[PDB]
Amino acid sequence: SDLGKKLLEAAHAGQDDEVRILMANGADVNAMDNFGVTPLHLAAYWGHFEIVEVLLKYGADVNASDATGDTPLHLAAKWGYLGIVEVLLKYGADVNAQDKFGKTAFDISIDNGNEDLAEILCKNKAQQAAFYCILHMPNLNEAQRNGFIQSLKDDPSQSTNVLGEAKKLNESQAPK
């Protein structure tokens, strides 16, 4: 809470190596002002992708909500930073999270008429859907479920096939 203020300011400004320095010297990667804004928020809002990667690598909370219920992903979607969005999604940002305006990163993408962003977001949603869909197989055991889950997280782009397999097995193990 002193090195932290300089971290917020260096993230806002866009000064890379200054941040790598601040980090190496052990500054709190999850510091916030009176509006619950963390350095990841500032670096997402202001379009600095390198600094996002650094902060993320140092373990910044990727689903941090500020005073308006807004997440780094929301703030990245507000300006159309495709590059940032993608890595934010790799570190496990919740694409369906809502804020005080009832906005989803998707809804925002629809506001700005951004179709590329929209298809990134959209294709991300099907995968979480596959997860939740696998979870509601009533004729599986915890071993099968977990196996399918771990297989999913090892390779998200296989989601659909994985789901297929699950259903096949599900109706194969139908009771009595």
Residue numbers in the entry: 12 to 135, 1218 to 1269
From the paper:
Here we propose a novel method for connecting the pre-existing α-helices of two proteins into a single extended helix using a chemical cross linker. EY-CBS (3,3′-ethyne-1,2-diylbis-{6-[(chloroacetyl)amino]benzenesulfonic acid}) is a chemical cross linker that can react simultaneously with two cysteines in the i and i+11 positions of the α-helix19. To test whether EY-CBS detects the formation of a helix, we chose two amino acid residues separated by 11 amino acids in the proposed fusion helix and mutated them to cysteines. In conclusion, we have developed a new method that can convert two pre-existing α-helices into one long extended helix.
MBP was not included in the crystallized protein solution. The crystal structure showed that the protein A and ankyrin domains were connected by a slightly bent helix. When the structures of the fusion helix with and without the bound EY-CBS were superimposed, the fusion helix was seen to be bent by ∼20 degrees with respect to that of the EY-CBS-bound helix. The asymmetric unit of the crystal contains 12 fusion proteins that can be divided into two groups, each group containing 6 proteins. However, the proteins belonging to different groups are in completely different crystal environments. Despite this, the proteins in the different groups have almost identical structures, with a Cα root mean square difference value of 0.32 angstrom. Furthermore, the simulated annealing omit map calculated using the refined protein structure showed a clear density near the fusion helix. Because of these, we conclude that formation of the fusion helix is unlikely to be a crystallization artifact.
